[PDB]
């Protein structure tokens, strides 16, 4: 144990609050429109450029120990808010700073900080209840378009793109974004059962195009194991040639000898066939082959429990699809006739599975299979020209996407902070058990006015003035910063998710209130 | 041997006392309500936040050698108190500091410190005897609820939860806490014989649910060895299919070949079976499978001494239970018909075992088997939102739990330090052998007033005033700090364990009195 | 995470702008004629000497962190411009600096930088549209000659050489430059099917010259596999000797035993034969052998798909060419009679391939095969007497080549910056959505006058004067710096690619406008 150092009372309080104020002034700019980006130095390549408040937050590290403690207690709020709701980081940080500063003023010699924490918790409960009461669900895609248009920092193309994605894939589809290439954004819909793996032999190339193999109404072979012996591969090709239709071979791997047979019958007379390996790592590829068989209609081969030997295959034992396309690094199955009721039951199985089980990575490929079997997958290849532009725009896009998915399931509320200001009468409605909880109530009451204050600040206007004049106005009337005036939000097209707001408020309030009761700080000696 | 340094008399005394005063001022706040947390810097992640006095104590390390010696002699008191009674750390630290300070004033050139130690020991004996005489056992669960409500730092939910745990599991049940997930705490009762291990083949999945296998009134197979040959596994399945009932296979491990037979008969016609490995890791499994067999009623297979070959099994040789459920990571046995007198005798065996043998880890799994066979196991999944909130609340909960278990077996006393103040007349009843023992007696007499003094200090009130006015009052009347006034404690619902008080007092008195006789200190030179 | 440092507002802005001004003053000289070279210190040898703006750019690294950030944001613009269009680096850097400086003046407390970025983007769109409208395609080789003559920094020999290369190879041929060896430049045309590998045995040397093997109308043998057994090699030589014509053996490798047979029949009776291995790669060598077979006219041997054993070869199964010559390190095939329609279809295959697929190293060897089959690649040896002169002249030549290839496909425009000045009325034609976009528009409007200003500066003349007097003049009239006066450019023979201009402008505008919105900079502490 390294020799440590201790500090008491107002000293440690002032140092920690200074550190938190440093970290929070670093970030509080990036709220709403008129916020301003932040450049961080990447140690190896180009620096990062952001508006996000966790890259900003998680990047900051302070030399002094106590200020470092402040920075850590802010970054934990940021990180929890991120991992819980994805967006609402800046709000978390600013509310945390305000709550901490208010806490480090009522710390008397007669006050009991734990009661302060309790009262803060009561306030948070009351305000979150008032939020959920004043929420409202999302129904029309106009609301989705609006929310997405917001969370790109006021970009409308992002809103339209996410709207079209959620419409052509469904409100619980699987959309994902990749680093775009061209100057502009792109919304691609990977439809059908498609996956990253190309035709093994470049002799199946019947496309007269960029390395494609195109079949129509072809049969399918689905082996969990490899295909080594000629005796194994031969009867399948026999049945295919008897029917005189193209054949796909989705299996673990193709022997060079059966491959030689294939290429022999392909170069000359030309038995329409094609060879492709399995989809993925271990068990996941097994389940995916099962799903592929049940989708196309047929039966997986190479089983353990029944094992379905290839020697005895049958014309109703093959996978059948309308069209198949293969490119050197991926293939697509289109019209698998797989007993739509049966695939429905499969879907119900895997959906109850995801409902019960999840690990944030299990459920990832879970929904992967769901979307790959039911309705496409949306990719969002973005514009941009520099890597830093790419990172910026992609960050904003992903943030908007997470906000939209949070808003689709749980209700929305009037944007621009108006919800909390409307919830303040709830705080006026509480009755504290004693003085200390009332102190905490007044702390949260002051805190609720903080965010719109910060926003008006960023706009370059009078914070408290705008906050008061908003509180005087109606329930739905509030302040736009872009138009710099008062309007109805939903009329104007500004709303926000309820889940993001509630999670951010809860995280910030909890961590800051816990921080307040600190009395004595111990730190490592500054040796090295 | 590194070159060292020596110091004599008042110098070394003052340095060690300065170090101990640093370490004890660091902690003395965290007593009773109105105590205040401490933030410690974790070297790698988020800082810790505490009220406990050993994290605080064990964290502190001083640059200067002599102050380091003081810190070590305080941390040893803290650590002994923890490992002995679990709670009573802060009290140990404060009493140790007060005893040390009183000791480093009577150190004359004519005084004999060893006699001082002797007198202190006599005082401690008298006071602990007076404690145990004025103790009183715990009878009703209201006392348990009260005590738990205290030791969450005045939280009532913790009290109610621990009370319900001890009621639904018994005053010597096995309750344990894990890092909760949701916003709120949770009291879960793992009942029956349940253990962390999932069904091997995901073909036994008859639940139509999140990866469950549910059987009712199924037979059991219990092998200490693996199940490789088809000849070995076959007769069991024969008997099960003859009776036409589901079967569980609890064994070391299942061959892929017998597994293939199982999956064959399961996918088609569907002999109700299920495969699960052995719960215990090592010899613990060698006992646990025996216990499982005797619980369900049957006989373990794969024995060494009789070895019970699987080829000749019998319908009365199987484990029989009412219901069985298996997840992907654990399963539960419910209604094992295992000769309740016989399981009783087994329980008596293992309980006499724990009574005789223990290693703090042997006896752990010992009570594990006891509770798993007799009445459930209580888990206490906690609330919280941040990792630091989790650590804080879990620490307080575990402390309350340890205090409750200490109080259930050995008597309780009036809380808020009143017991020692009531025991002071015992010190007024002693007769010293000579002057020095009388000096030690007066030392302990002053010491006994220290804690309530510190508590009133934390409250923000006059220490000696409150101590005196309490001493003037009745035996059961004392001071609440939350109501900041005088009440009857047991009337008010404040009590404490006698074991915690006695152990803390004994540890602090012993180590501090030993410290007092120090005359000359030697330290490592400060090279590196 | 190392302890970091933060800076706000005007401070970080001033530091980053100082760094960018350092890096841009380092480079801005090297534009047009009268630009001046830059010497960089190579850490292990002779230093580099350049006019390029990415050796200068990528070399510069600043001690101070913030200035380093400025340098990185400039080098990224330079590198993107390079990797996109190859030339137009200096223009990118200077436009970036001007845009950055203009940005770090309108940064008020009321201004919204994101709107500034938006307006800049609108300006860039308008200007690029006006460029493409005022472009014009390249038709006559005079234009190519002029462009190349420019981009060697006004060298005419470079222009003539690149013109002759593109004429004798076609506007989409494959020209490449290598480090010359003589005093002067040299344009070599590798025609026929030639590749780096020499005759294995130096007994086939019938040239009476510097290690050559010359055959006329010889047969060809093409094995994908080695040639080990005498039985394998013997029938080919049998057929060749029956026809009584020389034979080439292009295969994986020659056995020492078949080699012994060859040398036996060579030193004695004098069979005409020659042995050469494959090109030597992986799949690329197999494709090249296939193309060689289809070029000469014949069947590749050692195939996997269709075996084509050497034992049964046929007089129409051999590769046939007009003339073959072999060195010790490369050989050339001439007049391969390979079914010109068939080779045409092959060309169409590989060209659709390149049209669809590319990886910047796949399409490289792709065009390699295209040219090697249809038009001999043009190499450019550079004549210089110092290694540093070699690097300088070669850099300028490669830049001129890249500029020419960019200009051949996409249109050209009047050189010497006149295009942007002519596009400024487009900026006068826009209507901003609000004030901020108008600010950005005026930013770009000022920016467009920057480059010609810098050029007149380098010339030693009055920048703004020349810019204004050009703007007063006609559309096609502008300023030469070499003649230091006004002329018509296309009349005078100055033009430039539209792609270079558009890409440079776009990159610089994008990255600089993104940089403008920075508000807070975070850097690593300067520890080490
Ligand atoms: N035009 C707008 N006018 C008024 N308020 C807005 C506007 N756009 C966004 N906001 C508000 O600002 C917030 C966006 O700030 P943001 O960058 O997302 O910080 P965080 O990452 O913590 O969510 C939204 O919650 C919204 O209420
Ligand atoms: N409401 C209360 N009013 C008066 N005394 C209390 C109250 N709650 C706890 N105490 C007293 O304070 C002590 C709790 O201090 P504690 O945090 O447990 O320090 P330690 O870890 O050394 O036990 C109890 O022994 C009790 O006598
Ligand atoms: N003799 C010339 N007279 C007028 N303008 C010229 C002349 N030569 C080049 N230029 C102009 O200057 C530019 C050449 O600068 P350059 O060295 O190519 O910088 P960069 O590498 O960024 O392209 C050309 O785009 C051209 O418009
Ligand atoms: Mg946000
Ligand atoms: Mg305690
Ligand atoms: Mg150039």
């Amino acid at each position: 144990g390294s020799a440590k150092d201790v500090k008491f009372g107002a000293d440690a309080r002032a140092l920690m609050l200074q550190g938190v104020d440093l970290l929070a002034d670093a970030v509080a700019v990036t709220m709403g429109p008129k916020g301003r980006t932040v450049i961080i130095e990447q140690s190896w390549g180009s620096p990062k450029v952001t508006k996000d408040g966790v890259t900003v937050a998680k990047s900051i590290d302070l030399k002094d120990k106590y200020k470092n403690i402040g920075a850590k207690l802010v970054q934990d709020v940021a990180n929890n808010t991120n991992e819980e709701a994805g967006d609402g980081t800046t709000t978390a940080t600013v509310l945390a700073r305000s709550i901490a500063k208010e806490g480090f003023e009522k710390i008397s010699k007669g006050a009991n900080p734990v009661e302060i924490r309790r009262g803060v918790m009561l306030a948070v409960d009351a305000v979150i209840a008032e939020l959920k009461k004043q929420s409202k669900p999302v129904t029309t895609p106009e609301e989705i378009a609006q929310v997405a248009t917001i969370s790109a920092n006021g970009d409308k193309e992002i809103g339209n793109i996410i709207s079209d994605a959620m419409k052509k894939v469904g409100r619980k589809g699987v959309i994902t974004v990749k680093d775009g290439k061209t100057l502009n954004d792109e919304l691609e819909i990977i439809e059908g059962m498609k996956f990253d793996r190309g035709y093994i032999s470049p002799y199946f190339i019947n496309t007269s195009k960029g390395q494609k193999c195109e079949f129509q109404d072809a049969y399918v072979l689905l082996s969990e194991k490899k295909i080594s012996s000629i005796q194994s591969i031969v009867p399948a090709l026999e049945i295919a040639n008897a029917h005189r239709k193209p054949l796909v071979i989705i299996a673990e791997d193709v022997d060079g000898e059966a491959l030689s047979t294939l290429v022999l019958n392909r170069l000359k007379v030309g038995l329409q066939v094609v060879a492709v390996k399995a989809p993925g790592f271990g068990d996941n590829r097994k389940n995916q082959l099962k799903d592929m068989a049940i989708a196309t209609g047929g039966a997986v081969f190479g089983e353990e429990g029944l094992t379905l030997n290839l020697e005895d295959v049958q014309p109703h034992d093959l996978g059948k699809v309308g069209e198949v396309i293969v490119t050197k690094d991926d293939a697509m199955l289109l019209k698998g006739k797989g007993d739509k009721a049966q695939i429905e039951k499969r879907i119900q199985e895997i959906i109850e599975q995801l409902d019960v089980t999840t690990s944030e990575y299990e459920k990832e490929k879970l929904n992967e299979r769901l979307a790959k079997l039911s309705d496409g997958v949306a990719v969002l290849k973005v514009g941009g020209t520099s890597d830093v532009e790419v990172n910026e725009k992609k960050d904003r896009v992903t943030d908007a996407l997470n906000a939209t998915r949070a808003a689709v399931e749980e209700g929305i509320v009037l944007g621009g902070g108006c919800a909390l200001l409307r919830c303040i009468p709830a705080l006026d409605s509480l009755t504290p058990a004693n003085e200390d909880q009332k102190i905490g109530i007044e702390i949260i009451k002051r805190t609720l006015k903080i965010p719109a204050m910060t926003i008006a600040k960023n706009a370059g206007v009078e914070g408290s003035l705008i906050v008061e004049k908003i509180m005087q106005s109606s329930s739905e009337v509030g302040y736009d910063a872009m138009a710099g005036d008062f309007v109805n939000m939903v009329e104007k097209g500004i709303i926000d998710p309820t889940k993001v707001v509630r999670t951010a408020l809860l995280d910030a309030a909890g961590v800051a209130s816990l921080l307040t009761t600190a009395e004595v700080v111990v730190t490592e000696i500054p040796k090295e």
Side-chain angles (χ1 to χ4, degrees), chain A:
Chain A
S2 176
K4 293 181 183 291
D5 184 75
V6 303
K7 288 183 69 67
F8 290 161
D11 295 332
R13 295 189 180 97
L15 272 72
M16 292 180 285
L17 185 63
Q18 291 180 357
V20 171
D21 284 330
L22 175 60
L23 194 151
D25 294 333
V27 58
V29 302
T30 64
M31 185 175 287
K34 296 182 184 293
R36 293 181 182 175
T37 63
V38 175
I39 295 172
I40 301 169
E41 184 179 2
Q42 296 299 107
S43 67
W44 60 92
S46 67
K48 290 174 65 67
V49 174
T50 63
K51 188 176 185 293
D52 191 357
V54 294
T55 60
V56 174
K58 293 189 288 184
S59 65
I60 296 170
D61 287 328
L62 298 177
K63 175 68 175 177
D64 191 359
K65 299 294 183 181
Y66 303 95
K67 294 182 179 180
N68 191 0
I69 292 170
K72 296 295 182 183
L73 288 178
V74 176
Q75 285 185 355
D76 288 329
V77 176
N79 192 358
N80 284 319
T81 301
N82 188 1
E83 294 181 355
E84 182 63 25
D87 191 358
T89 70
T90 307
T91 300
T93 63
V94 295
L95 292 174
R97 183 184 71 190
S98 179
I99 295 169
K101 182 171 71 67
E102 297 291 329
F104 295 108
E105 291 182 354
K106 302 296 188 292
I107 300 166
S108 68
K109 187 174 87 276
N112 189 0
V114 179
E115 291 292 327
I116 299 168
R117 176 178 173 83
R118 296 182 183 92
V120 176
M121 303 304 290
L122 274 71
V124 177
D125 293 330
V127 61
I128 63 170
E130 180 59 25
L131 293 177
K132 289 182 181 178
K133 293 181 181 180
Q134 66 185 359
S135 177
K136 66 181 181 180
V138 61
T139 62
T140 191
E142 288 76 358
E143 295 179 353
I144 297 300
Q146 294 181 357
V147 172
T149 301
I150 299 303
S151 294
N153 193 357
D155 189 358
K156 292 179 72 174
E157 284 77 0
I158 305 301
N160 289 318
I161 296 301
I162 295 170
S163 174
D164 292 333
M166 186 176 289
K167 291 184 285 185
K168 294 180 176 66
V169 177
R171 290 181 177 178
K172 294 181 177 66
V174 175
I175 303 91
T176 187
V177 63
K178 294 189 287 184
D179 292 332
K181 182 65 70 177
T182 187
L183 278 296
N184 295 319
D185 294 332
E186 292 179 353
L187 176 60
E188 183 177 0
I189 300 168
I190 299 301
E191 183 59 28
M193 297 178 73
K194 183 175 182 179
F195 65 97
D196 54 359
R197 188 172 296 279
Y199 58 93
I200 291 88
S201 174
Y203 294 166
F204 305 102
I205 302 166
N206 58 1
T207 191
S208 178
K209 190 66 176 177
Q211 300 295 322
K212 296 192 290 183
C213 182
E214 183 181 1
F215 285 158
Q216 294 83 15
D217 295 332
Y219 293 93
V220 182
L221 182 61
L222 299 175
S223 176
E224 185 179 3
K225 65 183 182 293
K226 288 184 179 181
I227 293 171
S228 297
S229 176
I230 301 303
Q231 182 60 254
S232 65
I233 189 64
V234 61
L237 282 73
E238 295 173 354
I239 296 171
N241 192 359
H243 292 89
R244 181 71 272 173
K245 289 183 179 180
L247 180 62
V248 300
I249 309 303
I250 299 167
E252 181 181 1
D253 192 358
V254 172
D255 186 1
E257 183 62 26
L259 187 278
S260 298
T261 64
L262 297 171
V263 295
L264 182 62
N265 291 313
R266 177 63 179 85
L267 275 67
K268 55 186 176 180
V269 62
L271 183 63
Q272 293 178 356
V273 298
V274 61
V276 298
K277 298 181 179 68
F281 304 161
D283 189 1
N284 191 0
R285 71 175 173 184
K286 293 182 181 180
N287 288 319
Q288 184 171 359
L289 269 74
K290 179 68 178 177
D291 298 332
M292 295 177 73
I294 57 175
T296 184
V300 64
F301 295 95
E303 182 181 358
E304 297 85 3
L306 194 62
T307 305
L308 276 300
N309 285 318
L310 298 174
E311 294 81 1
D312 53 355
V313 298
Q314 297 175 358
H316 68 87
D317 198 2
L318 279 69
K320 298 181 178 67
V321 297
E323 291 178 352
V324 176
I325 296 169
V326 180
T327 61
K328 288 178 70 66
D329 200 2
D330 57 355
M332 184 183 289
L333 299 177
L334 281 69
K335 283 86 169 64
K337 280 76 177 174
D339 187 1
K340 295 183 290 294
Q342 182 179 1
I343 61 172
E344 180 62 26
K345 294 180 181 179
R346 181 70 175 171
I347 297 169
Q348 300 297 321
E349 189 275 333
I350 290 97
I351 61 171
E352 294 181 355
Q353 183 177 3
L354 62 87
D355 292 329
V356 176
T357 188
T358 188
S359 178
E360 188 269 332
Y361 182 74
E362 298 176 354
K363 188 177 187 294
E364 191 273 330
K365 296 301 292 180
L366 203 289
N367 291 318
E368 174 68 27
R369 288 180 288 169
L370 271 73
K372 186 180 288 185
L373 189 151
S374 296
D375 282 325
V377 293
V379 299
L380 292 176
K381 295 182 292 296
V382 299
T385 65
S386 74
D387 298 331
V388 60
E389 294 171 352
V390 172
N391 293 319
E392 167 58 23
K393 189 175 181 180
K394 181 171 73 175
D395 189 359
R396 286 183 291 110
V397 172
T398 60
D399 291 328
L401 187 150
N402 288 319
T404 59
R405 287 187 295 175
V408 296
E409 65 182 2
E410 190 172 1
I412 66 170
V413 70
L414 293 175
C418 297
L420 285 71
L421 283 76
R422 298 294 185 271
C423 294
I424 294 171
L427 292 178
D428 291 330
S429 63
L430 269 295
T431 61
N434 59 6
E435 178 60 24
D436 296 334
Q437 296 179 359
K438 187 262 184 65
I439 297 169
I441 296 170
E442 297 302 330
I443 296 169
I444 302 300
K445 184 182 289 185
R446 290 181 178 177
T447 298
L448 294 176
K449 295 179 176 66
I450 296 298
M453 186 178 289
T454 62
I455 296 159
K457 184 176 179 180
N458 288 319
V461 300
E462 181 61 25
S464 66
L465 185 150
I466 302 299
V467 174
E468 180 64 25
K469 192 179 185 293
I470 293 171
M471 291 183 287
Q472 293 300 109
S473 296
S474 175
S475 296
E476 75 283 17
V477 176
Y479 181 74
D480 184 2
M482 187 60 68
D485 56 359
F486 289 171
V487 298
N488 187 358
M489 297 293 172
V490 298
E491 181 179 1
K492 180 67 177 177
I494 300 174
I495 58 172
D496 282 323
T498 56
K499 182 177 179 181
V500 54
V501 175
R502 59 186 293 277
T503 60
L505 176 58
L506 186 149
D507 289 332
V511 173
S513 67
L514 191 276
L515 171 56
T516 61
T517 62
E519 179 65 23
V520 172
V521 174
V522 173
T523 60
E524 293 182 354
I525 194 164
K527 292 185 289 185
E528 291 181 353

